[PDB]
Design a protein around this ligand. Structure first.
Ligand SMILES: *[C@@H]1O[C@H](CO)[C@@H](O)[C@H](O)[C@H]1NC(C)=O
Ligand SMILES: *[C@@H]1O[C@H](CO)[C@@H](O)[C@H](O)[C@H]1NC(C)=O
Ligand SMILES: *[C@@H]1O[C@H](CO)[C@@H](O)[C@H](O)[C@H]1NC(C)=O
Lengths: 50, 50
């Protein structure tokens, strides 16, 4: 008797799921912005749920 | 006067015969890490054979 290899059964399709939201994250305007914060006082921005 | 005192003598015979898959344990059934593992030596055969 000889254990040759494993028996890892392949998947039969793929499933993807995500938060069920459509909000966008305000990123582009941040880079477009001429107004900008300082370095010794760098600004914080809690981006979430987008 | 004499006596008989039957006593128990316990002896191990067979420890649970374990077998470990060489690559299922090391790689979670992926594509690149399996190649990287086979890039190593003949350890899949060595450990499984032992
Ligand atoms: C979740 O998304 C599906 C598909 O877009 C939609 O039919 C359903 O109403 C959504 N439910 C919630 C709670 O967002
Ligand atoms: C604003 O920023 C976005 C993201 O970096 C960039 O794609 C776009 O070209 C920028 N707009 C201008 C006018 O520079
Ligand atoms: C020897 O010991 C046993 C153990 O109980 C006992 O039953 C028996 O009577 C003894 N023999 C004598 C001669 O006392």
């Amino acid at each position: 008797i000889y254990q040759t290899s494993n028996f890892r059964v392949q998947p039969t399709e793929s499933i993807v799921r995500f938060p069920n939201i459509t909000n966008l994250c305000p990123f582009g305007e941040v880079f477009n912005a001429t107004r900008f914060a300082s370095v010794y006082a760098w600004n914080r921005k809690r981006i979430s749920n987008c | 006067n004499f006596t008989i005192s039957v006593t128990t003598e316990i002896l191990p015979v067979s420890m649970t015969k374990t077998s470990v898959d060489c690559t299922m344990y090391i790689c979670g059934d992926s594509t690149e890490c399996s190649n990287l593992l086979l890039q190593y030596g003949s350890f899949c055969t060595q450990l499984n054979r032992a």
